[PDB]
Amino acid sequence: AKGSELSERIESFVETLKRGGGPRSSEEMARETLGLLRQIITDHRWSNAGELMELIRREGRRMTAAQPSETTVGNMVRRVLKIIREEYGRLHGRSDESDQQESLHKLLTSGGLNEDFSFHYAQLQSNIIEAINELLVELEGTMENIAAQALEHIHSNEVIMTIGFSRTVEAFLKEAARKRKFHVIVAECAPFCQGHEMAVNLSKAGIETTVMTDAAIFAVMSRVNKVIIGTKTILANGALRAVTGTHTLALAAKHHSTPLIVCAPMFKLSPQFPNEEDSFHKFVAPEEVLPFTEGDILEKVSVHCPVFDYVPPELITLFISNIGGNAPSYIYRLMSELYHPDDHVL
Amino acid sequence: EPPPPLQAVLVADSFDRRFFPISKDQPRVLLPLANVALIDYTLEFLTATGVQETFVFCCWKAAQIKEHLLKSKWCRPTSLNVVRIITSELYRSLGDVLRDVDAKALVRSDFLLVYGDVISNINITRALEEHRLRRKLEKNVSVMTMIFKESSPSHPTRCHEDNVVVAVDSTTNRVLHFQKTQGLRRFAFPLSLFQGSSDGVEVRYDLLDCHISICSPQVAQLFTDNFDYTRDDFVRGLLVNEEILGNQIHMHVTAKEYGARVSNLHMYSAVCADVIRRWVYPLTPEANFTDSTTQSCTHSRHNIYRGPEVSLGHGSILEENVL
Amino acid sequence: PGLSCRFYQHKFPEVEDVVMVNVRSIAEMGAYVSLLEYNNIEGMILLSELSRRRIRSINKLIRIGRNECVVVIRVDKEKGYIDLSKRRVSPEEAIKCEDKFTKSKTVYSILRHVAEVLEYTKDEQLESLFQRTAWVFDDKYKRPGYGAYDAFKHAVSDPSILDSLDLNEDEREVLINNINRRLTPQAVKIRADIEVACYGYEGIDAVKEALRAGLNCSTENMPIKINLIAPPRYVMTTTTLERTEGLSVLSQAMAVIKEKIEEKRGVFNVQMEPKVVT
Amino acid sequence: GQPHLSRQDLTTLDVTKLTPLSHEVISRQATINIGTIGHVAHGKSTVVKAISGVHTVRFKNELERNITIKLGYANAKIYKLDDPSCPRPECYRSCGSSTPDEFPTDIPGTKGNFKLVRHVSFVDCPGHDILMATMLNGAAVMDAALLLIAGNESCPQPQTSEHLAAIEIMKLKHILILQNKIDLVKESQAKEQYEQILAFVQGTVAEGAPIIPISAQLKYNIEVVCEYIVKKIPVPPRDFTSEPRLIVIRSFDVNKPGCEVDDLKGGVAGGSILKGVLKVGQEIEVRPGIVSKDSEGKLMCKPIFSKIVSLFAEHNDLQYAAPGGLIGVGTKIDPTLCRADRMVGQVLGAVGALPEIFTELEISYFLLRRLLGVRTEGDKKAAKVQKLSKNEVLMVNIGSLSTGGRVSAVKADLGKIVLTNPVCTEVGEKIALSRRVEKHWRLIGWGQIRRGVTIKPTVD
């Protein structure tokens, strides 16, 4: 019953991550990961917090290795680990938290920490489940919270440039368009021309929208007042793992000193630095770039189709999340209060 | 009346000597392509496309095939694709396998017919839906849907041995004539194709044979009735005898998905090159779709896949497409 | 029209009483909500009583237009102030509150439809109707909300409960009609697909005997029907207003069919287990 | 079980007294077989339709298998008018098998009630599978022939030589020639066509045969055909005393979808009876029954034991069945084993009175070298018959029992044939061979079963 269904659901989730993913959005990915972790906490037998953390880490390692580019799963796993740590520290008699967990000059000078998760508390599970339910409730409204800040960053008759299809950015722009008039220019983001769809929906809302290929980004940037983009991942230093062609857009914006605003929720923040790991880009089949019907020309030509682009934090002006606006220089703090440094490597 | 779970008939024996003498000590379906056996590629394709029951028919070196399959990912209780291995020493052709399928009444509805050396990432849902709709509109008329891939005739994955030319009614994607162009310099098409369809009789030479079929049980019934029948014999006999029996063969052409059959060493080299260069994504060497600890690797620049515990000498250069 | 009435008799809730509310506005001290079970009276979910952990913005956990289960922590009938807490609500209490609210809303919908049929135009008429029918059961069973729904459920199959009321002829007729229309349990169909075949000398006789042996295991109020789909695959179908024992009865009907057919050197298999078909 | 026909009683039944002209048997089922060796588009089917009316077939499958091989049958009752005033052949009349044994005259022949005389069955095949069906086994496939030549063309048409070669190879001594489609033919044209016909059949088996001109579409001179069936065609000798045997040709699952449990029926197996009489309630064995393979892939056969629930002959219900037509035995076998003609190629007989089950045969074949009665137009090698080769799939036709076979070895003239499915036969039986020339199976020789590999029928 418990195991026979939990293991089956874990296998189904891992297999879906490995091959496809469907039309699932990032919010859906986070919600399903949170449900999986909640069922793991409830169903599996763990005595103390240490065993529960080890089991959660073991499941999260497999879930992450299923698809490294899907960082939302790892983000949710680390969020649950931090929640477990916070609840255990609250029940272990440590008074205030979320400050001594992170390495700090003041904490280092005035003492330290000696972690121990061996003790057993019967009320730990209920507290953890309540915290996870709060996390899910916050997820149900993060998009609305982000969209509610639309009128504070768009003025009348403004030209806004966007790339790809981002549902968060679409909701942001649609909320802004209710009281304001502005012109949106969408780059198609080849080869997966999702921007086309982004242009259709914005056209159904009455927004004056324009479609153009990625080759015209620099040419049109001279007449663009603001840039609003989504992202797939926000790295620990404020960098972006966005759709391909976003680095070029950021460079073009930096040339004209056009502000670049990233509308991304809290669960897209990943504590992984862009050191290396050779697992950043996601290379899909080269059928999208060069068709198979080319012929013998394909036997001596190396075709590469990266999906994601790395945007350094220097080219980003502002991060708009469900908690408000932040500079890329503050992202580190949002790391420390969301994830524990010991949980960075699952 | 929902259709039963999709089933597949996998033929683990090629029933020819196209890999002699390499096949003297190893079955073709166990030859490693990019360090992964071909039957693993076929089983992964079947599982991904949504096949819930698979019948693997092994004749040549069936013991080795069974031993490899039992340790595979698809013979685990957690697998949604139940693999059942049927072995017999009286198999000499695909006709024998299909006659035994009919005798055992294994399949009740449309199933997938593939060989054990087919590398593909094709999702068969659209073709299966078209096949079911055709069989619903016209009862027991269309009996088989072959899967083809758009390609240029000059592509390296098109050997002269397996090259085919198809005369097709483009309005309904119905195969009217099927021919093999091995050793030919002038392709002849009977005028009887131009009888009913006065507009679309497209002669296509741009179709690459993926050797994947969606077959109704009528295919097995006809193989039993015509005991002298390979798949090409069945197709030719069905197209010739359309007057006596009103059966039809249709085709589905995919352009964005990869599919090929490793039927010789030239095709083996071409398919391995395509696999290394991510043409069959997500079936890439680093994806570890076989779920094996010894077949994991990291994918660096220039399609260079490096496994664990690999020592590289000083000054060594891996240019590109190296696993 | 805009006819409305309290779900219960008492006009105000009590402390430590989980209630259903609808968030209406966001303020400084907390979220201004309306109590759904008490004719939409104003209440405030305090910002302090919102989460056990520290919370930076009320919008993190509160969305306008979303229902909530909150425990009352302070009532001032004079000023009209009701203070609600979300932190103190346990998940089991939330489930109980949801079930109670569903039952009370069903009863309220029944009574409102009755009033609309009777062309009631003022809230006083609806309050009187609630006094006659629902709250009488509520304070007879000493269980607000639960009692009225339980008494209404006791009807349909037993209209003897609805005669001690002081209703009129039209009121009683309309109440009976609405309760039977919106409260009569429906019938679910349970279907299973099995395989029965005999390759011995008995042949079709053994299969028919096993099928009839499994067919006779049917309760009078619950018929069991067995039909051929296509040999050796047959279908067993039943229609029952209640489902669990129907699934169970199909289960050991399959068991006895299997036992009988295997007694006669037959072969038995199950294609699809009993399942509720729409 | 059906009114207005002669009563059949098992208690008042004796096998020794039974004769092909018995009134009780003829009243319900055909007793003699007259194969029609004609050609499509020449009235081959139209003649049979005119003679025997229009059939409906009690049981039919949704999918027809081996339609180009199936040996179709058509029953026709032929009656004689007892009034001497009515001139011949108008006294002889053909009708369906559902008619009562006597009906009043429908013509002004000054009274006289028609009386049943004989019941015939037309063995018609869409091709020439009749040839190797009956060419060496003999059995009781038929004892007459109906050679058909149309009138619009000029004898001999390129489709006639094969028919005459067939008539010769079948060793049939009783042949009647029916000149069809002569209605739109001048008298001189008909006379010269008859002269050409007699020149073509000169020195052949069709020497002393009628050349009766008929019109199938307008039903002209059919009574002459009935008269020559009565007189020219002799009564064949049949053996009603031995244990019954039936070669299964058809097989149906009669249970309609969504039927009640009490309405379930067994498997109806149509077939042809060779020697003996089948009785309702008789224990029967069908061989090789269930053929399966072991885990390693070893053939095993379990004969199916059952009881005759009922017997059918076209639309008539029988109590005892005798050779001379297509009899459908409704039995107690599960419909799973008898659905969609899945029992074709099995022998159904009395318990313990069936031949041995063979998987391989060692035959002494005499290979033909040119197709019988074929005009070699242009391609001289097209009509040539190549020698037997290894791994070649032939079509072994032991009587009405069709089965495939792969030639495994040939030494000088002893060929080993590995049958696709095991079949019931005995050592020393006459078999024939066929080869897929193009779009068809054509006879290429015959032989004798010198030896063979047998399989022990496991019984539980």
Swiss-Prot record, chain A:
Which controlled-vocabulary keywords does the entry list? Cytoplasm, Disease variant, Initiation factor, Leukodystrophy, Protein biosynthesis
Under the heading Pfam families, the entry gives: IF-2B
Gene Ontology terms for molecular function? ATP binding; GTP binding; guanyl-nucleotide exchange factor activity; translation initiation factor activity
Localization per record: Cytoplasm, Cytosol
GO CC, alphabetical:
cytoplasm; cytosol; eukaryotic translation initiation factor 2B complex
- Keyword field contains Cytoplasm: yes
GO BP: any one term:
oligodendrocyte development
The main place the protein resides is cytoplasm
What controls its activity? Activated by the chemical integrated stress response (ISR) inhibitor ISRIB which stimulates guanine nucleotide exchange factor activity for both phosphorylated and unphosphorylated eIF2.
Matching InterPro entries: eIF2B_beta_subunit, IF-2B-related, IF_2B-like_C, NagB/RpiA_transferase-like
Disease linked to the protein: Leukoencephalopathy with vanishing white matter 2: An autosomal recessive brain disease characterized by neurological features including progressive cerebellar ataxia, spasticity, and cognitive deficits. Brain imaging shows abnormal white matter that vanishes over time and is replaced by cerebrospinal fluid. Disease severity ranges from fatal infantile forms to adult forms without neurological deterioration. The disease is progressive with, in most individuals, additional episodes of rapid deterioration following febrile infections or minor head trauma.
Family membership: Belongs to the eIF-2B alpha/beta/delta subunits family.
**What name does the UniProt record give this protein?**
Translation initiation factor eIF2B subunit beta
Swiss-Prot record, chain B:
Describe the disease involvement stated in the record for this chain. Answer: Leukoencephalopathy with vanishing white matter 5: An autosomal recessive brain disease characterized by neurological features including progressive cerebellar ataxia, spasticity, and cognitive deficits. Brain imaging shows abnormal white matter that vanishes over time and is replaced by cerebrospinal fluid. Disease severity ranges from fatal infantile forms to adult forms without neurological deterioration. The disease is progressive with, in most individuals, additional episodes of rapid deterioration following febrile infections or minor head trauma.
Q: Which residues carry this modification: Phosphoserine?
A: S93
Post-translational modification, as annotated: Phosphorylated on serine and threonine residues by GSK3B; phosphorylation inhibits its function.
Covalent link (Glycyl lysine isopeptide (Lys-Gly) (interchain with G-Cter in ubiquitin)) residue numbers: K24, K66, K104, K180
Mutating R158H: what's the consequence? In VWM5; Cree leukoencephalopathy type
Species for this entry: Homo sapiens
Places the protein is found: Cytoplasm, Cytosol
The encoding gene is EIF2B5
Residue numbers of the full-length protein present here? 38 to 361 of 721
Family per UniProt? Belongs to the eIF-2B gamma/epsilon subunits family.
Q: What's the name of the protein? A: Translation initiation factor eIF2B subunit epsilon
Disulfide connectivity?
none
Post-translational modification Phosphothreonine, affected residues: T284
Which positions carry the signal peptide feature in this UniProt record? none
Taxonomically, what lineage is the organism? Eukaryota, Metazoa, Chordata, Craniata, Vertebrata
From Swiss-Prot, chain C:
Q: What is the activity-regulation note?
A: Activity is regulated by phosphorylation at Ser-48 and Ser-51, which stabilizes the eIF2/GDP/eIF2B complex and prevents the eIF2B-mediated exchange of GDP for GTP, thereby preventing the formation of the 43S pre-initiation complex (43S PIC). This results in the global attenuation of 5' cap-dependent protein synthesis and concomitant translation of ISR-specific mRNAs that contain a short upstream open reading frame (uORF) in their 5' UTR, such as ATF4, ATF5, DDIT3/CHOP and PPP1R15A/GADD34.
> Where does the protein principally reside?
cytoplasm
- GO MF, one example: ribosome binding
> What is expression of this protein induced or repressed by?
Up-regulated upon endoplasmic reticulum stress.
Keywords attached to this Swiss-Prot or TrEMBL record, sorted alphabetically, are:
Acetylation, Cytoplasm, Initiation factor, Mitochondrion, Phosphoprotein, Protein biosynthesis, RNA-binding, Translation regulation
Q: Name one GO biological process term.
A: cellular response to oxidative stress
List the InterPro entries.
NA-bd_OB-fold, S1_domain, S1_IF2_alpha, TIF2_asu_C, TIF2_asu_middle_sf, TIF_2_asu
- Please list the residue ranges annotated as the S1 motif domain: 16-87
Protein location: Cytoplasm, Stress granule; Cytoplasm, Cytosol; Mitochondrion
Q: Which Pfam families would you find in this protein's record?
A: EIF_2_alpha (PF07541), S1 (PF00575)
* SUPFAM superfamilies named in the record: eIF-2-alpha, C-terminal domain, eIF2alpha middle domain-like, Nucleic acid-binding proteins
Q: Which residues carry this modification: Phosphoserine?
A: S48, S51, S157
* Annotated Gene Ontology cellular component terms: cytoplasmic stress granule; cytosol; eukaryotic 48S preinitiation complex; eukaryotic translation initiation factor 2 complex; extracellular exosome; glial limiting end-foot; membrane; mitochondrion
The question of whether Zinc is a record keyword is answered with no
Gene encoding the protein: EIF2S1
From Swiss-Prot, chain D:
The region called G5 is annotated at 215-217
Q: Where in the cell is it found?
A: Cytoplasm, Cytosol
- Describe the subunit structure: Eukaryotic translation initiation factor 2 eIF2 is a heterotrimeric complex composed of an alpha (EIF2S1), a beta (EIF2S2) and a gamma (EIF2S3) chain. eIF2 is member of the 43S pre-initiation complex (43S PIC). Interacts (via C-terminus) with CDC123; the interaction is direct.
Catalytic activity annotated for this protein?
A: GTP + H2O = GDP + phosphate + H(+)
User: Could you name the Gene Ontology cellular component terms for this entry?
Assistant: cytoplasm; cytosol; eukaryotic translation initiation factor 2 complex; extracellular exosome
Region (G2), start-end ranges:
66-70
Tell me the InterPro entries matching this sequence. Answer: EFTu-like_2 (IPR004161), eIF2G (IPR050543), eIF2g_C (IPR015256), eIF2g_dom_2 (IPR044127), eIF2g_GTP-bd (IPR044128), P-loop_NTPase (IPR027417), T_Tr_GTP-bd_dom (IPR000795), Transl_B-barrel_sf (IPR009000)
Function description: Member of the eIF2 complex that functions in the early steps of protein synthesis by forming a ternary complex with GTP and initiator tRNA. This complex binds to a 40S ribosomal subunit, followed by mRNA binding to form the 43S pre-initiation complex (43S PIC). Junction of the 60S ribosomal subunit to form the 80S initiation complex is preceded by hydrolysis of the GTP bound to eIF2 and release of an eIF2-GDP binary complex. In order for eIF2 to recycle and catalyze another round of initiation, the GDP bound to eIF2 must exchange with GTP by way of a reaction catalyzed by eIF-2B.
* Entry superkingdom: Eukaryota
Q: Region annotation Interacts with CDC123: residue ranges?
A: 447-459
Signal peptide span: none
In the record, which positions carry Phosphoserine? S6
Q: Does the keyword Transmembrane helix apply?
A: no
